[PDB]
From Swiss-Prot, chain B:
Gene field: hcxB
Gene Ontology MF annotations: (R)-4-hydroxyphenyllactate dehydrogenase (NADP+) activity; hydroxyphenylpyruvate reductase activity
Transmembrane segments: none
Assigned keywords, A-Z: NAD, NADP, Oxidoreductase
A Pfam family annotated for this UniProt entry: Ldh_2
Annotated protein name in UniProt: Hydroxycarboxylate dehydrogenase B
Amino acid sequence: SGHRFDAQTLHSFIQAVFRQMGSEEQEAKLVADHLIAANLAGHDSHGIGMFPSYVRSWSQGHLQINHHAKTVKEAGAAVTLDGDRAFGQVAAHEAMALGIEKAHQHGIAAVALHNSHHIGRIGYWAEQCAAAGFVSIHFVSVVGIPMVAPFHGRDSRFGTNPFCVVFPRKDNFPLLLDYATSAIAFGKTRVAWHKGVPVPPGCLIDVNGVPTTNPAVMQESPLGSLLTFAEHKGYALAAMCEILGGALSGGKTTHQETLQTSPDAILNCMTTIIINPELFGAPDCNAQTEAFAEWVKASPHDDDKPILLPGEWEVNTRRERQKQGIPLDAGSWQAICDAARQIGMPEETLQAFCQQLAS
Amino acid sequence: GHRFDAQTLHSFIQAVFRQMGSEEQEAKLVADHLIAANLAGHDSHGIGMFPSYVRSWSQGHLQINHHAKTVKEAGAAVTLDGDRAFGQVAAHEAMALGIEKAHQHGIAAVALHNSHHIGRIGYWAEQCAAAGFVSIHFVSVVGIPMVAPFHGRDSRFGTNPFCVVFPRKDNFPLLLDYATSAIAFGKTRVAWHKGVPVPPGCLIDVNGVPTTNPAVMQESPLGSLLTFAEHKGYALAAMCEILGGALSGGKTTHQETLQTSPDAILNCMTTIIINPELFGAPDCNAQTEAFAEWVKASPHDDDKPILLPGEWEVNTRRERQKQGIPLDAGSWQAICDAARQIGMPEETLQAFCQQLAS
Ligand SMILES: NC(=O)c1ccc[n+]([C@@H]2O[C@H](COP(=O)([O-])OP(=O)(O)OC[C@H]3O[C@@H](n4cnc5c(N)ncnc54)[C@H](O)[C@@H]3O)[C@@H](O)[C@H]2O)c1
Ligand SMILES: NC(=O)c1ccc[n+]([C@@H]2O[C@H](COP(=O)([O-])OP(=O)(O)OC[C@H]3O[C@@H](n4cnc5c(N)ncnc54)[C@H](O)[C@@H]3O)[C@@H](O)[C@H]2O)c1
């Protein structure tokens, strides 16, 4: 028995909860901006539901509040940053701003960010680049929490290592590819497990390497493992993200020495290439893009399942959720409220927010 | 079938292109790329392309003795028109210009539109990696719809490959190179000739119904390839269409741009080339090697060990350099027929066959 929450009011609440944690004003805003945007886009695993986990990471000495990305190298068209375990919502925002400026100066630039706390929905960083008028390409690794098996392997070796590319369009939503290199997102298994239903086949193996559709293998001991998408194809991409993101950013790849001591210590590396599309000799680019968009959607389909462009799913969800509210399941909401209580938000403050959110 | 010595097969291929009309350097460039594809184990893009190239040329698509022309040069980006040259020529010229530009700028891009078939994409990435660079390639196939969008029931775009490479000092490069379709078009051609099913989740028929019958890609009524991993391969195919086809200054697939022949294989490719040394990553080598060993330690069958991206092609090349390139009899017959079609004298062709047989 879930709820629908007004996005503006819920943002106010999320921001208040990070102030209570100790975040200063700008930090709390940056965190709330990213989390609410993930909820609006339909990517709820990276939304307000991350809050209890973030408190745990911080309490355990991993996530550091009120930190900033530090420049460790700047050379030609590339800047390299140490996220210093800051909120990824802070460090990646700082990284994009520096990278976008570098692309203004050089036409094509790169920003590498290692050792940032969880950077959330990667499409959000791409949207910043696209709003400034650039193409961007992002290789992301998750440092030292193995949860995905290599093709041919029977246990976890690397993170869900997302890949993201964006193409900006004048007066339209950007074409946005953004996804994990695993066969299914980790959060999907968490949802399926709570609901008592299986996941699709070809996504999971159990502790012994045997294919399974039971999501309990990702949520209870003995832990199994996620598979990569499309066998060797998702695996090749996950490995390229590990190396271009993890190693090439100046960060850590996953191996014995680098494993996290907690499942809440979620650290990302990201290498981003930012490209001014106007440098190319493509006078007909807009018309060719639009002609293809129209042609691809004319493919025969069920009425309830029209063809989408990359990034259109998020745009449509956002529109629905601005109008109807953000849905939160009752268990996640309880966990959120309980976590807010435990960091010292007074009961009366939480009551007043709940009354505002009931409207 | 047969097993052919790579070096002899190279001489043959080169001579066949001279006979077609290619000048020496073009014939060499075409032979280099085709034999490398066979050595790497990607036979669809190897010597077996020759009959299709002859058909394409005869129909006025592929042009012999053409070159990529620089149509724009702005900052770190160069844009080329391939002029329907052999892709083995146009893309070679594109990589050379792009690598030069990346020497100059640290990070550069080269866009190539309107090139004839550029073959195995990893080959261009290997040139970038050999010069010390990371490269990323978005490729579209112009106006040959073969693959359905996720939720669609017919073909709307090409097999649109994606490629990324990371160079390693004194080692093979980490090389991702694949089509965005669920299965290679070539594999369906093979499974048809051999009369076997393809795996499930790869094909739909003319009415959009799932099938394992490769007949649907080979006879009428034509069905369609699916993308890999549903929306995932579909989103990547669409980004390749746009970043490759549209942004390179080329054409995307839609009604007005459909080819009139299945052999009119024209590629657009947008390549970003990145000097990895610009990043502040003093432990990059060690972190890369540590990951490589760690990922291989995952429990596995002895006969199916874990590979790095690119390792498969490296191993195949070693095996085929030693054992020879295998060619199926039907393909070899098509190659010999195409050689006669472009006027190679019977005695020249026979001389080559005898040298290849021994
Ligand atoms: N920060 C991290 O370490 C981390 C790790 C893994 C995943 N993530 C994030 O989790 C989120 C979800 O990941 P996922 O792998 O579950 O993604 P997903 O399976 O939901 O894929 C979403 C992508 O596919 C597109 N898409 C959806 N439906 C489509 C359709 N019918 N046609 C064409 N395209 C369609 C979307 O527009 C988007 O590009 C992403 O935002 C990702 O960045 C973050
Ligand atoms: N228009 C075009 O020019 C065009 C179109 C489509 C495909 N192609 C080419 O066709 C070729 C084949 O495409 P495909 O989709 O069938 O490729 P594929 O399925 O053979 O995948 C090849 C990729 O996966 C990697 N790989 C293979 N086994 C692996 C393993 N066990 N672990 C990790 N990685 C592994 C390879 O090293 C390579 O990067 C490619 O070279 C592609 O460039 C060209």
